[PDB]
Every structure is written in structure tokens, then in C-alpha cells.
mmCIF file of N, CA and C in Angstrom:
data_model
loop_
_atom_site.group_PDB
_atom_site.id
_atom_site.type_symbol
_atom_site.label_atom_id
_atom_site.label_comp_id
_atom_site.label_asym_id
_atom_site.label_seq_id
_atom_site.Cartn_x
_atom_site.Cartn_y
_atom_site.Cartn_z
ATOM 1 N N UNK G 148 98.455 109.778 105.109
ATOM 2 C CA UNK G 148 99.548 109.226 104.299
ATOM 3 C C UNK G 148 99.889 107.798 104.702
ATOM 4 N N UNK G 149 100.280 106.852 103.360
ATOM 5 C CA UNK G 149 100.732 105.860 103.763
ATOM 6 C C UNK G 149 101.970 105.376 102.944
ATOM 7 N N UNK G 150 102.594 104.614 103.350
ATOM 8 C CA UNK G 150 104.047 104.239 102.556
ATOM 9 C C UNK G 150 104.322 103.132 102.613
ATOM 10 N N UNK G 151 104.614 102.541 101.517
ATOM 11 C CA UNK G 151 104.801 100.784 101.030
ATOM 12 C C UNK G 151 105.566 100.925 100.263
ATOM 13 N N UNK G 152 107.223 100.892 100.036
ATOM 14 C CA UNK G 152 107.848 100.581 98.934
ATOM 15 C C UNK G 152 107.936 101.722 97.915
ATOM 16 N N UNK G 153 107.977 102.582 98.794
ATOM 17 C CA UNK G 153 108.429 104.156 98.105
ATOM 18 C C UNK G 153 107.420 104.531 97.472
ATOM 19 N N UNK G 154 105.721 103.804 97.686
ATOM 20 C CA UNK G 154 104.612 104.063 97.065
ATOM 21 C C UNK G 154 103.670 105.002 98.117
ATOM 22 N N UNK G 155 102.960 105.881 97.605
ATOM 23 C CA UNK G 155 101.949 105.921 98.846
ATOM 24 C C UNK G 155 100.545 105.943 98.729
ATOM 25 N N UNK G 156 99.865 105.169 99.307
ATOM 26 C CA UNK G 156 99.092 104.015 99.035
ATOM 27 C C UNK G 156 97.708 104.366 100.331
ATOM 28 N N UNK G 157 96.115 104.428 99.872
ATOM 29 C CA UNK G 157 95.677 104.577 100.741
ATOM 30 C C UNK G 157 94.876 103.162 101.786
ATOM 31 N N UNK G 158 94.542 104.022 102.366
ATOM 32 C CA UNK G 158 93.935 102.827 103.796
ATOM 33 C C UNK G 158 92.398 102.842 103.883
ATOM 34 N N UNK G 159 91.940 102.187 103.331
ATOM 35 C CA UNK G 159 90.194 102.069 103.420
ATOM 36 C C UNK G 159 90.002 102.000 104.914
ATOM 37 N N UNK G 160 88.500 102.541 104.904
ATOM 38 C CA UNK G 160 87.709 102.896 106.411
ATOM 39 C C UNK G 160 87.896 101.798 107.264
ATOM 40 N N UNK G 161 87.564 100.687 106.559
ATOM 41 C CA UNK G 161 87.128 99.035 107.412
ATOM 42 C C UNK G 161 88.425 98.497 107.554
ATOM 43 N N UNK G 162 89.513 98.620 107.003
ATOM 44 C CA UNK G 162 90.912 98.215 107.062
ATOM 45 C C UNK G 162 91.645 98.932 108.252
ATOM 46 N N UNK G 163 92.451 98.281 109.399
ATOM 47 C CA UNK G 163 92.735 98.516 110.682
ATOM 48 C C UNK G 163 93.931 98.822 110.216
ATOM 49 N N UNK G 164 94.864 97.870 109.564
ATOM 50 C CA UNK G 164 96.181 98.242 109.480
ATOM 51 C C UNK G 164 96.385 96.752 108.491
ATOM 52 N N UNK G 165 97.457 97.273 107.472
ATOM 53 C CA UNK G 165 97.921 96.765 106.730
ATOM 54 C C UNK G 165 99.513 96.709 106.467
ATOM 55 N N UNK G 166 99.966 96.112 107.235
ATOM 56 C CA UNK G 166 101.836 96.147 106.660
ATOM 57 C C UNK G 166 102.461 94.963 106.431
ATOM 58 N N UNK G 167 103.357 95.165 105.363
ATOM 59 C CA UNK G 167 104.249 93.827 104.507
ATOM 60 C C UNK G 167 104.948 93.594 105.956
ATOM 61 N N UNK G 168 105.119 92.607 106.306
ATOM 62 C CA UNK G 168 105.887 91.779 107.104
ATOM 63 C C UNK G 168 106.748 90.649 106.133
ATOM 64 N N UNK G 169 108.229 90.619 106.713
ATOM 65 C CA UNK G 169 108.823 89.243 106.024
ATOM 66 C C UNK G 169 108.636 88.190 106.383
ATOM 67 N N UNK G 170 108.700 87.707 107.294
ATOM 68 C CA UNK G 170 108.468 86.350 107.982
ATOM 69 C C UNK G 170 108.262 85.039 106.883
ATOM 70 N N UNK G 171 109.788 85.168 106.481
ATOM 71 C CA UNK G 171 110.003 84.068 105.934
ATOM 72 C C UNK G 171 111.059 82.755 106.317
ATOM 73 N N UNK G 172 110.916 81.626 105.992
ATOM 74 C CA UNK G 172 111.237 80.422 106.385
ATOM 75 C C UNK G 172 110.480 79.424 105.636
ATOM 76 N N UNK G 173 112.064 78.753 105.020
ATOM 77 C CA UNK G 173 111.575 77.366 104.048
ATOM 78 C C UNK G 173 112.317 76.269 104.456
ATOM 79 N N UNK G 174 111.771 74.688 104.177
ATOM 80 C CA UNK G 174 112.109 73.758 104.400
ATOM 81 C C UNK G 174 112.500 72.747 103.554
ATOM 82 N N UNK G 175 113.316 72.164 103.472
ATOM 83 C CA UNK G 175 113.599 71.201 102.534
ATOM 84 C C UNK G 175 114.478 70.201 103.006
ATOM 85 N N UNK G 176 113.582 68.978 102.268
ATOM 86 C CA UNK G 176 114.268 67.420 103.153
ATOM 87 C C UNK G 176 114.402 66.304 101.735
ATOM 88 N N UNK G 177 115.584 66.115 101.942
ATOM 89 C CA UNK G 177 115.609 65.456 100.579
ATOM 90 C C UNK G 177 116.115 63.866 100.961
ATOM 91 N N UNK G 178 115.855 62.655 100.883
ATOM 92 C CA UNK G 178 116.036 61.385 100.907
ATOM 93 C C UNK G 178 116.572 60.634 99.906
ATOM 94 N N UNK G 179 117.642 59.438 100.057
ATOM 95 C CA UNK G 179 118.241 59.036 99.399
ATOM 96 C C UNK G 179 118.887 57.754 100.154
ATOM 97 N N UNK G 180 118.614 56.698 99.140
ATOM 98 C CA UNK G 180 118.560 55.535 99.403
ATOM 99 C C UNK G 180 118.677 54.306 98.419
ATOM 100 N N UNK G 181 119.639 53.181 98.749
ATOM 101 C CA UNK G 181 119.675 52.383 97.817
ATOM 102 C C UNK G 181 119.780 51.306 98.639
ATOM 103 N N UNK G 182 119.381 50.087 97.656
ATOM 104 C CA UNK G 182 119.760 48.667 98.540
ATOM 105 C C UNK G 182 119.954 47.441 96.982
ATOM 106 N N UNK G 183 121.186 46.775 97.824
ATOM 107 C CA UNK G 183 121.899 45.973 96.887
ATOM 108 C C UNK G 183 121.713 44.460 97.073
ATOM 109 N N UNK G 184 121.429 43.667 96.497
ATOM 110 C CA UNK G 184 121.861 42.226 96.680
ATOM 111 C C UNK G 184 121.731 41.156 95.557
ATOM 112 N N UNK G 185 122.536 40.414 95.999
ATOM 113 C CA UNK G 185 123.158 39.174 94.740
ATOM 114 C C UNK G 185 123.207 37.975 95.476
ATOM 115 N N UNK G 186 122.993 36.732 94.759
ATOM 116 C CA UNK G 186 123.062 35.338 95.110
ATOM 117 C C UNK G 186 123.748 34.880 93.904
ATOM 118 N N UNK G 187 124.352 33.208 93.610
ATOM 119 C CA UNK G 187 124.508 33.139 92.744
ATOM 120 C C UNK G 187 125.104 31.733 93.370
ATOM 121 N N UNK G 188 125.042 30.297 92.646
ATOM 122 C CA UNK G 188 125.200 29.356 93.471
ATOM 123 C C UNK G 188 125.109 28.165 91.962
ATOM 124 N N UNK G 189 127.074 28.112 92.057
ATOM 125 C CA UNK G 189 127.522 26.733 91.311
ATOM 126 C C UNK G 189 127.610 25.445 91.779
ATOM 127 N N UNK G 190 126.690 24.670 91.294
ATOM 128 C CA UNK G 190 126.912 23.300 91.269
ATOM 129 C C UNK G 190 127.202 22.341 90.062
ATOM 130 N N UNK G 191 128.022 21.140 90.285
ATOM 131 C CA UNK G 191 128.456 20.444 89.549
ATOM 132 C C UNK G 191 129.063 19.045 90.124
ATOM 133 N N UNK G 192 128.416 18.286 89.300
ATOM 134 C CA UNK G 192 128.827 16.725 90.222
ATOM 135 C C UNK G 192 128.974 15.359 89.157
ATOM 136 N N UNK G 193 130.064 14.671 88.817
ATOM 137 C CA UNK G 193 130.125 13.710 87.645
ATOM 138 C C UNK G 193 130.661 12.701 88.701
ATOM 139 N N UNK G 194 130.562 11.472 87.705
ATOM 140 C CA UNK G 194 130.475 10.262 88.419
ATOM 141 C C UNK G 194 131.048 9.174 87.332
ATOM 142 N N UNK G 195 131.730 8.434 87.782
ATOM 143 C CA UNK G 195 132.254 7.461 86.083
ATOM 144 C C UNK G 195 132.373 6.462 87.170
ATOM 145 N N UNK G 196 131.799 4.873 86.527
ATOM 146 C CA UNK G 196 132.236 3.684 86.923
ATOM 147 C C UNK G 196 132.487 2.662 85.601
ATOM 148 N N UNK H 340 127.880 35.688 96.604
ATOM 149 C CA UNK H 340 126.717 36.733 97.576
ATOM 150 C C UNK H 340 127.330 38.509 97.917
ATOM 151 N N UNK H 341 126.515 39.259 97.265
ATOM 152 C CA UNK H 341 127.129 40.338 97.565
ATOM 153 C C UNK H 341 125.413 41.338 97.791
ATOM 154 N N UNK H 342 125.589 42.051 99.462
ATOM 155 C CA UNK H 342 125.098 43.221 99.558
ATOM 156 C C UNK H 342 125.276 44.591 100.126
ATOM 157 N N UNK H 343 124.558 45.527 99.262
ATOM 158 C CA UNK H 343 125.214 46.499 99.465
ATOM 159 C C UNK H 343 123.923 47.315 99.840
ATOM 160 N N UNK H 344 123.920 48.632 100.543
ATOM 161 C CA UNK H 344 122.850 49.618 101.769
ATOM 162 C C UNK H 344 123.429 50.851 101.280
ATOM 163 N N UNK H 345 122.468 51.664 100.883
ATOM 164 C CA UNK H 345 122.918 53.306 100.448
ATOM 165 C C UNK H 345 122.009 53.854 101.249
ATOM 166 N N UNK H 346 122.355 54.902 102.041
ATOM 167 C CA UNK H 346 121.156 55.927 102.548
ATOM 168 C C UNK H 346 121.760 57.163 102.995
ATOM 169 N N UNK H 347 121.382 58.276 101.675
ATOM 170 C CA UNK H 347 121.648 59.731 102.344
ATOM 171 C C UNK H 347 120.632 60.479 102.685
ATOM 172 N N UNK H 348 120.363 60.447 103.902
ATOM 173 C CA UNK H 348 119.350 61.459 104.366
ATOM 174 C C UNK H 348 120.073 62.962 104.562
ATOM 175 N N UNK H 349 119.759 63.549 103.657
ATOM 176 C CA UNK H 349 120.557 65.065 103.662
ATOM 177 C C UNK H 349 119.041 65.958 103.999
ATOM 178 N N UNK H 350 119.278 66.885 104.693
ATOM 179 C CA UNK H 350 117.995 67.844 104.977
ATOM 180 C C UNK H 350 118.396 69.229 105.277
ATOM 181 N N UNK H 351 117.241 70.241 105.275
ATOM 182 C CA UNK H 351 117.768 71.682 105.512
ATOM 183 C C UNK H 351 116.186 72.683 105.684
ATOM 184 N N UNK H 352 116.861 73.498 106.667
ATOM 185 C CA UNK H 352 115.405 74.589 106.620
ATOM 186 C C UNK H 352 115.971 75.486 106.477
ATOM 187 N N UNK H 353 116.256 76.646 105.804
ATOM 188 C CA UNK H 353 117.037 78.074 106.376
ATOM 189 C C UNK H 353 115.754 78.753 106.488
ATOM 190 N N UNK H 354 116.033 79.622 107.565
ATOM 191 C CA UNK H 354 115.467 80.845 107.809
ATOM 192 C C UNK H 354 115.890 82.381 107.715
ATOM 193 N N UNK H 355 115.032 82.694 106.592
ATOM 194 C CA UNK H 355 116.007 84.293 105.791
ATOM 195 C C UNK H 355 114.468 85.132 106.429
ATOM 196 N N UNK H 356 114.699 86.089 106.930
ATOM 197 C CA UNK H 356 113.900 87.173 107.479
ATOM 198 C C UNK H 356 114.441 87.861 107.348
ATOM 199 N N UNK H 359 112.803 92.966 103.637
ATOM 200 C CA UNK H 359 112.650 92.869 102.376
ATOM 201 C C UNK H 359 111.608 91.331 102.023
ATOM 202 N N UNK H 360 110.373 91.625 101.363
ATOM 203 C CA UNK H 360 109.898 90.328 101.375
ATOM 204 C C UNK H 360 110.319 90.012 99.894
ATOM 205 N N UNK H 361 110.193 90.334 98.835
ATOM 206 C CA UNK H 361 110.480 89.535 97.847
ATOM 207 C C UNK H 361 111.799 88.830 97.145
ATOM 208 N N UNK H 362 112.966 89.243 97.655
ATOM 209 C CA UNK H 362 114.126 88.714 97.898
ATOM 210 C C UNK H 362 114.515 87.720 98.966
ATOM 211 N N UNK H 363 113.145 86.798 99.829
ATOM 212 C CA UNK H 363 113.309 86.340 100.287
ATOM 213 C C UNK H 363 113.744 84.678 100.004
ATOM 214 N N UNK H 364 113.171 84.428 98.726
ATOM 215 C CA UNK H 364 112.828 83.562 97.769
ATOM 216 C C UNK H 364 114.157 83.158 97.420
ATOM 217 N N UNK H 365 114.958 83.537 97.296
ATOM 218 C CA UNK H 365 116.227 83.855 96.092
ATOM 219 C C UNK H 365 117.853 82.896 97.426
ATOM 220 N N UNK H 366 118.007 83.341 98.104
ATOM 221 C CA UNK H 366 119.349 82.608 99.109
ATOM 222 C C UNK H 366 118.337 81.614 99.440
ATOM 223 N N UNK H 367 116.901 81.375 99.419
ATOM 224 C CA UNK H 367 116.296 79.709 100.228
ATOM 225 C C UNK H 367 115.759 79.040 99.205
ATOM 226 N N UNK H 368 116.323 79.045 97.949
ATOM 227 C CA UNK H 368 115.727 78.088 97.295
ATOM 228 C C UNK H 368 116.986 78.099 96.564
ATOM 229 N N UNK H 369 117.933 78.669 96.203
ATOM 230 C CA UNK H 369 119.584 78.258 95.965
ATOM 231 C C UNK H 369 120.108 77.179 96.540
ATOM 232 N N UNK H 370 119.393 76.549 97.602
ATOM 233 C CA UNK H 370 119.555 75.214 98.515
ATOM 234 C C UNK H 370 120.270 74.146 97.464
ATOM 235 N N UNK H 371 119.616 73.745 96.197
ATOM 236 C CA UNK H 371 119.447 73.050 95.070
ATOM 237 C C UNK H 371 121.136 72.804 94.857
ATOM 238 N N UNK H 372 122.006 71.732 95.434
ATOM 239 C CA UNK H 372 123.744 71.814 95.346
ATOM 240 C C UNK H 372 124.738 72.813 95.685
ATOM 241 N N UNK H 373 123.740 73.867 96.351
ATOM 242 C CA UNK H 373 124.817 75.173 96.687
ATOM 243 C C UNK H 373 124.406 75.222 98.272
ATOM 244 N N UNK H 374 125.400 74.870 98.978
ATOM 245 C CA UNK H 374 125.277 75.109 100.163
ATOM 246 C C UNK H 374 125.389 76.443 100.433
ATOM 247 N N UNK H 375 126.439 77.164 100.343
ATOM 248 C CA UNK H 375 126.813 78.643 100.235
ATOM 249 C C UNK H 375 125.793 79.249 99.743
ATOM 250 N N UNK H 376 124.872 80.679 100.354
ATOM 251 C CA UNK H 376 124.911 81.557 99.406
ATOM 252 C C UNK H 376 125.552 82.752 98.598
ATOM 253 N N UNK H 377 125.409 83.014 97.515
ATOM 254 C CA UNK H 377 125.531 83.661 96.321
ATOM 255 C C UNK H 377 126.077 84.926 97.017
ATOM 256 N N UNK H 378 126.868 85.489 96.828
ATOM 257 C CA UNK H 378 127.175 87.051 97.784
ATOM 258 C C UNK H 378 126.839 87.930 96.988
ATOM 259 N N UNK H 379 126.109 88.247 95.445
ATOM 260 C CA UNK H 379 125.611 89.179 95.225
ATOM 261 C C UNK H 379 124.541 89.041 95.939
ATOM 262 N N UNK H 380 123.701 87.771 95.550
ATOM 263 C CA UNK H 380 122.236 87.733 96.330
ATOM 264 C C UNK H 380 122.543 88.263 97.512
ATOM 265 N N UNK H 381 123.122 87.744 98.116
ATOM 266 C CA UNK H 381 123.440 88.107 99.992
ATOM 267 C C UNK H 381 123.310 89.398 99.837
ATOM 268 N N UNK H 382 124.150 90.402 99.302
ATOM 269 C CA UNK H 382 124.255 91.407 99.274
ATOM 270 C C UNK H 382 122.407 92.254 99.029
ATOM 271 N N UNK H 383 122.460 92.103 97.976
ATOM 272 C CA UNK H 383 121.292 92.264 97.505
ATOM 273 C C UNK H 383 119.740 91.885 98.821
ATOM 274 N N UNK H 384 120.039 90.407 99.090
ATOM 275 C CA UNK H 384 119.236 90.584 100.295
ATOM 276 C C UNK H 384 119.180 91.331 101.292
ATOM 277 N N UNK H 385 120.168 91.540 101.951
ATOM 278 C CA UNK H 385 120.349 92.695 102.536
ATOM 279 C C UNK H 385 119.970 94.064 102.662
ATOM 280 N N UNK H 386 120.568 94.368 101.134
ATOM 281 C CA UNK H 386 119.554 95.997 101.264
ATOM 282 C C UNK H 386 117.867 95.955 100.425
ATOM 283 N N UNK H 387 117.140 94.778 100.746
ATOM 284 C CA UNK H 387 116.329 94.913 100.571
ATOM 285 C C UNK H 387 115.506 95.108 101.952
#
């Protein structure tokens, strides 16, 4: 007899052992980024003679 | 002259150890820090 999930399920000759394990773990990396810049440059010059 | 520097480095791994309900509280990551307490629940008795 074998049991998986309320199923029962057989085990071939060459197969040692077979069981669901959870071994779960996820990753997530999220980046965020901005960059700003401005110039801006008045000139003005009069002259009367 | 104006500058301005943005940088959010936000990051995350959870580790949830039922296998197919494993999926479900680690990928809720997506603006929900919290998980879901049916899911929770639900994870649980899986």
C-alpha cells in the first residue's frame, strides 16, 4: 500500500521511494529609481550711447 | 537649477513550508504585505 493525497497509488520495482515534500521558498526583489535634473540660464545685456 | 534622486529598493523572500497551496500567501507579495487569512487558513490545513 501506498498513500498520496487520500489516493493509493503504486510503487514500481526500480523506484526506492517517492514522497511529495513541500520545500517551498520564493524570492522577490523589486527596484525603483528615478533621477531628476534641470538647468536653465537667463541672459540679457543692452547698451545705449 | 533643480535636482532631484528617487530610489526604492523594496525586496522580499518569504518562506511558506501541503505543496500546492504553497503558491498562493508567496506570490500575494504583489502590494499586499499581509497575508489573506482565508488563504492562511486554508494553507494551513493543507
Amino acid at each position: 500500500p501506498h498513500y498520496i493525497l487520500n489516493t493509493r497509488f503504486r510503487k514500481p520495482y526500480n523506484v526506492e521511494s517517492y514522497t511529495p515534500q513541500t520545500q517551498g521558498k520564493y524570492e522577490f526583489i523589486l527596484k525603483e529609481y528615478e533621477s531628476y535634473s534641470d538647468f536653465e540660464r537667463n541672459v540679457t545685456e543692452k547698451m545705449a550711447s | 537649477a533643480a535636482s532631484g534622486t528617487q530610489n526604492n529598493v523594496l525586496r522580499g523572500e518569504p518562506f511558506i513550508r501541503g505543496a500546492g497551496f504553497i503558491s498562493g500567501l508567496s506570490y500575494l507579495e504583489l502590494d499586499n504585505p499581509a497575508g489573506n487569512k482565508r488563504r492562511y487558513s486554508a494553507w494551513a490545513e493543507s
